[PDB]
Amino acid sequence: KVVIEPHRHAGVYIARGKEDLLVTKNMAPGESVYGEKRISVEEPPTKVEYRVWNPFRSKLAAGIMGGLDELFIAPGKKVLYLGAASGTSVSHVSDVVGPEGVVYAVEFSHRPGRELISMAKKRPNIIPIIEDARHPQKYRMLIGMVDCVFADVAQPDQARIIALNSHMFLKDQGGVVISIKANCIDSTVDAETVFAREVQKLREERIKPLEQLTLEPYERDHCIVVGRYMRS
Amino acid sequence: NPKAFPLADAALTQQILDVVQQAANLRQLKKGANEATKTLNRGISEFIIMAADCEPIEILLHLPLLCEDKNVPYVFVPSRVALGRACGVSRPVIAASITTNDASAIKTQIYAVKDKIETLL
Amino acid sequence: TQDSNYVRTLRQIELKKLEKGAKQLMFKSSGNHTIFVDSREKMNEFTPEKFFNTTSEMVNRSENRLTKDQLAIMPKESLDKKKLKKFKQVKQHLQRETQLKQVQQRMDAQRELLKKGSKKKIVDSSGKISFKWKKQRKR
Amino acid sequence: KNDNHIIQAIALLDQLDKDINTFAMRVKEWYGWHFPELAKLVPDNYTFAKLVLFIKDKASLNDDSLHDLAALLNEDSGIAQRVIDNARISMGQDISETDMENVCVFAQRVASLADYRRQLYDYLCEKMHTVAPNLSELIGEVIGARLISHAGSLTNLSKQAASTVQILGAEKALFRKNKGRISRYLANKCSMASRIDNY
Amino acid sequence: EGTLTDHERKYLNKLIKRNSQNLRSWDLEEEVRDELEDIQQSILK
Amino acid sequence: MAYVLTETSAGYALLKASDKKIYKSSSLIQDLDSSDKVLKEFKIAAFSKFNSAANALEEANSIIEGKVSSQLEKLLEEIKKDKKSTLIVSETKLANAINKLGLNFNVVSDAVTLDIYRAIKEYLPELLPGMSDNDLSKMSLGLAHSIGRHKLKFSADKVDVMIIQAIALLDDLDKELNTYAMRCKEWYGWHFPELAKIVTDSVAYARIILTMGIRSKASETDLSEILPEEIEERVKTAAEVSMGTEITQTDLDNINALAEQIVEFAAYREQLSNYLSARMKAIAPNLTQLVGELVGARLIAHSGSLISLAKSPASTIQILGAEKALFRALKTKHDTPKYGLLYHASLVGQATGKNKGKIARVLAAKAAVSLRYDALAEDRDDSGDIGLESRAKVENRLSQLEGRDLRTT
RNA sequence: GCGAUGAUCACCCGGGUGGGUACAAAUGGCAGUCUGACAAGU
RNA sequence: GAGUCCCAUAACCUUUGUACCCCAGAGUGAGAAA
Fold first, then answer.
1. Contact flag F254-D22 (C-beta cutoff 8 Å)
2. CA at A4, C1' at H16: how many angstroms apart?
3. For the domain that residue B83 is a member of, what is the CATH number?
4. Which cysteines are cross-linked by disulfides (chain C)?
């Protein structure tokens, strides 16, 4: 049998064995959101179904294998997820937070949005918000406080989006996880120098960075910046 | 034609239609929406060119979705009749795809336009 | 034409096998991991074990770096050669897919000759043989 | 004397149960889209068909309606209060009046098959007593009816030896180491009853 | 409360050793990594 | 007096702030760190709860647009008694709208206030009594779907999953209605075995049992509505010379129930057929005009979604339903099929000889065009105009293709 | 206080593994959705 | 140009769940208990 083991971050597991993969417990057993493999293992014994997490599809997953020291996503926390193209990555985040936590999924495009709504019924803890993240005042009613703000929006003005939402919705000392694509911002200069600018931009916005991770080999010219929100 | 997006300017459209004509002569061009849709599935398309003037424009609106999934650049040119003459056929062609061939004699020109199309997107 | 159909079908089968096979594996990350520290003295005294609160060998394990708190029947050499085989199998999937692509291209190049048109054989110094069609619109 | 009625009613009793299950499963899905939770609330498929027949559109929620649906089955399970609360709040997307029309009409169809199946099950039991009272009394009306079907006719069953009759029902365990002995002992006594019935 | 005795500091440290050598077996050797890493890059490229 | 306008999925909460210029103090973060301090500084003025989801969606959309809802008006109407009071409103747009109402309120929206909404909404569940965190989190989930459906313009008349279930269900009805008919031949056949050889239609067979229960009744029973003249006399003659034995009323009553069950199964199968047509006429009508509802529905089901079929090239739509012969042929280097599932389209049937192969190619290509307009059109009209024009081109192509004669004249 | 109205006839540590028959499910596998510019008339 | 017509509306294999089995079959044919 595959030996599921705990991992440094709560809510994350590795089905270690002959074939070893990152894995999360399924919130809605008996179905896969996007065709990933599913593994169930008996624990005293009761079988608990799990879902495989593919790094190449989710950048949050690509962060884990890099060995991110601190992720503010953990069981029983409210999380704000920006740029919810579909449930490829949101479902896994919903798994980590668990029933006590909630996930506020924000998306703009209509066509992916209907896919996102199709999943949110299966996951009660996910609150889908189809709206543009550049005007957070629109969906202020539907969102509580959130311990973490994780953003995958690939926009040249993403830094503004984080600041606006974080000012409104992020708790003090909360989490901020940002996915940066160097090509979208400035393709002329090397991927490193683009990231240094984005770090500096966050600091002006009262966000203290903690650590930086490049996501090779999973994708090229991408990096995740993890910071904490110092309002004081 | 607001749905057609991105839409190449006058300067770019010339460069695209120059690559299309060179592609057709070397038999490195697939013509029509239904051929292009296949090469995405087989993953041999360098990039896809499209005719904004098509009515009803939706008949080529499936390809942009495939392109985003497969990460293939695409671009819209303002007139379908021009594209047909660019390809080297008698009829209106609403979409075209340049096949991948790293040994081709016009590889450098294909990449140059592909780089510009990516920027536009 | 039927040969092109047969060869393309085999190529498509292997792309799906390669896609499924790649998903099963996990690939160790290879990326820089910068840490930000406010005070220059904190920078000079920085030690990975202290920051991560792990034994030194656990620091170098990127996927599952466990803080010292968490730390508190198959022969492995056999489990290894099997894991290496599983990786060895996916590359053979990539190779058979690539070979079927080259065969499918050369066969396509021939079928273009069979079709109607005016063409000239151009030979490079390296000896590569290519055909350039004349600029004649198709009726 | 005719026993072909027994062979044929049994062939209906199983087929109805297969269909009543299958169609009821489709009532579950169709009404599941409009409101998935109730499928979890009332696992009993027959009750779900009846309950769906009453709560067509979940927006219709009245204390009087709560009493009505409370009358359906019992409030001991608490489903009556649960349904109103989940009815007020759910992710079920509302479906058209035409789509609602088929679910109830299709649900009405499943009701008829169950009601007819119950009516038939009485008919078989009545006929088994009148045809093979000895065999029916020994093992049962339904099981004895099945055994008559395996042998092909009450006459064929009686004509068979005791050892053959044991294996006639050995694929469905009709008659069923100490356990084995009672089966074979019971197997003979079935042949004894069959002969009395047939001649 | 940071009230470890020296003996307390010794028993815990053995666990750190104990579980580590256990995960070392699942964490696996270095040599096979040498061939495994070479196969890995081939797939990714 | 100082007032704070707060919007919640439960509804609208108004909060009287003790200090008139709380928005002008620079230590708000410290002042409001704890629930007690927020409770002490802010007291509920009037809370009008949201009665139903339909009201909730209407009220929410007003906030998104920044309009003052009547609910907001009425709750604001109550507090007018305070002359010269200050209202603190989260967004400028809503503040301007309230400022246009002419109330006796000094409406304030400033960056300083963001601290206050931050603190209040952090401790909202404690601030609001009777509502638990789970209830608030749940009702937001329902409201988020309700607003999500509106923004996406989800319409109950445009869900393809009803097609997929309907067509799968329709096939099952045919088999189950078939088997019950085979037996109702057998079971009533024991009484009267000659019927089936005369009458083959199942519904016709069942309706006979209802009108006459017994061969005796065959003499006076009239079967004109069920059977023509020459057939009905046949069963009358066969009734008297029948080989089968008499049955009890107990058997007859139960066989009637089966017979009554056949006709009901026939009627509903028609009802589902019309319903499927109505669904296909609203979800992809341009396809329906061209290929037809029955062939149209099967095409959607086979791919699994209307969108998935849209992404398919025209060729695959030609040979959709014959993968087995296709992929067998491709691997064995033999010629591939032509028709797939489209063979049952009406236009292909009208064609003859090799024209069927060409029409399948023409109809499939035009099938994709009509389909991609159904699936991916934002403001599609429920008219089917594009298909009808496509239907003309196929009909013209069929005429000239068929008009040709291979034989020399 | 019997019987011809029918006697007789795999593994491992109270527990776990192996095998066998029937039914249901799987967004599990086999498994990869044909070609692509001429054709018809005088 | 080109096999709908060997049910991709399907067959077979794997996994899970449910209900059972670990005897012989044209089964043997006078013992069993003491």
1. no
2. 19
3. 3.30.1330.30
4. none
